[model samples]
Target: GSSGSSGPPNMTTNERRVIVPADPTLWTQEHVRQWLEWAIKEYSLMEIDTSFFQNMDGKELCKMNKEDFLRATTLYNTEVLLSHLSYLRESSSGPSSG
Candidate 1:
């Protein structure tokens, strides 16, 4: 039972590495489309479990079926990712919660 920082020693490395993209242009729409396609396909393979639906809008979503939830999640994730990218592009530093 690892409950504290000292319970298990940190497994992270102090080493740092620079990442250079092989083809930076691949970050465009093509990359996004490919990722979305893969994600949708992968999620379609799993069975829906409603055990964790406490306080969630289960009734509304249930009326629309699982595809609605998948679409909503996909849209939200895409929007957040794009917003972060936009922030990064505007400022060299990435977006921060604070």
Candidate 2:
């Protein structure tokens, strides 16, 4: 997606800010770039899926889920990834059950 940023093995505020969207579900190519480029730069490897963020079309990603993500990427930190994806949903869409 992009040349992306590289700061270490850990995720950064800058990275999250770039990756998480104002509207979490409707991700664009640029949005994927913000996330994927970071992956390639993070472990320093190209990253996944209908699954994590792999070869699926951007529109395909919009209709996918975590289970789908795991199946595709074969990689993840459940707490971390879910947390961030959830966080991206904060103050967005509609009111939550919480």
Candidate 3:
């Protein structure tokens, strides 16, 4: 008699939260807009000009520094946006198969 436990146990964890891609750097303009929409709602921000990112992409957005964001918009939520962006960048979780 041989006992081997090599199968599926319990993999029911489909609780999704943020809608951003795993690698935000490769996000397209549409992705950026979607993220912004989610961020605005999540941060309770109002009166934000979504058009400011008309020509912006995820790559370009990541390239912009805090000062760039500050100068680019006169809104008060720039820091919040910047902080969330940086946090996403830092935690760009991707599967690393070993």
Candidate 4:
């Protein structure tokens, strides 16, 4: 009687998961910057003083009201930010029947 045990050389597991439209409340500073950058390009907003938004994270961003945005940025930019916030809020809160 003869028995042979199997021998493996490599054990590799690859799994990839992406964050799709994740909650803004959980976004980091870099995420906030990226979102702002994307928004600026999407809206074709120019002459933006990015310095006003420096050092701000998404948590703080979520706390800001329209008035706050106005004080920090331009009128059009403020409204854009508010609209984006509205979108975030709407998507984050689910109206489910479960």
Candidate 5:
């Protein structure tokens, strides 16, 4: 089968799709779980294990800039994370922490 624009080439079939919470502040371990695998492949990252990011609350993550982000990761495909954070920040829902 041939097509023109399907979507981001890195997209894959994962059964864990989520609604991408309108508020980053509402993001929790479950949300992270849903996105980790896809983010892993999309970012060319080795892992974002609980140990590495356990303390990073969603609010903290949402506010982090590239410099702050790099402290924890090489972030090979930073756009992947940035786009997600931007979406959360711009959502009509709202933000609580950070």
Candidate 6:
């Protein structure tokens, strides 16, 4: 997580609530909008399992629905998995696996 202010210093609850480690640098309305667009594309391509969350989005995650929260958790898990996969692939071919 590269640390650098990418948006305003003060953020609304909605903004703070949705920002995560995967995108901590994002801090503006425009960043949020861009992230949402990316999320939609990534989610659509992944076709993630929705039975766990009833197909809810970030707005729903903020609503405190257990199902929706789980869905968000799943997305986070997916991000972690991808990171690990990238590391593994890099390790196999790159000069330094540090």
Winning candidate number (TM-score): 4
User: Between which residue pairs do clashes occur in model 3?
Assistant: none
Task: Pick the lDDT winner.
Answer: 3
* Model 1: residues with Cα > 4 Å off, grouped in runs: 1-73, 93-98
Q: Write the per-residue lDDT of candidate 4 for residues 34-72, one digit (tens) a residue.
A: 667666756766556655667678788788887877776
lDDT of 2: 0.51
Each candidate structure's TM-score, on Cα atoms with residue i matched to residue i, is 0.24, 0.44, 0.65, 0.66, 0.55, 0.24
Residue-by-residue lDDT tens digits, candidate 1, 1-98:
36654321222334532232223233343333333333334344223222222233312322333354444454554444344334433443345565
* Cα RMSD, model 1: 14.1
- In model 6, which runs have C-alpha deviations exceeding 4 angstroms? 1-26, 45-98
Give the higher-lDDT candidate: 4 or 5. Answer: 4
- Per-model CA lDDT versus the true structure: 0.35, 0.51, 0.69, 0.67, 0.59, 0.40
**Clashing residue pairs for model 5:** none
Candidate 4 whole-model C-alpha lDDT, 0 to 1 = 0.67
Model 6, span 2-95: residue lDDT tens = 7884532343356333343232222243443444434444443244442333443333323333343345445564564345333433343337
Better of 3 and 5 by lDDT: 3
> Which is superior by lDDT, 1 or 5?
5
What TM value does model 3 have? 0.65
Better of 3 and 6 by lDDT: 3
lDDT of the structure predicted as candidate 6 = 0.40
Against the true structure, candidate 2 reaches a TM-score of 0.44
**What's the C-alpha lDDT at position 66 in model 3?**
68
Comparison by lDDT, 2 against 6, better one? 2
Please give, for residues 14-69, the per-residue lDDT of candidate 5 as tens digits.
66444556777666755544454457654556534434455656666677787666
> Looking at model 3, which ten-residue stretch has the lowest summed lDDT?
7-16
- What value does the lDDT take at residue 59 in candidate 6? 38
The candidate with the higher TM-score, 2 or 5, is 5
As for candidate 4, its clashing pairs are none
Query: What digit string (tens of lDDT, one per residue) describes model 3 on residues 2-95?
Result: 7885532222235634455766687898777677766675676766666777678999888977677766554577888887777678665755
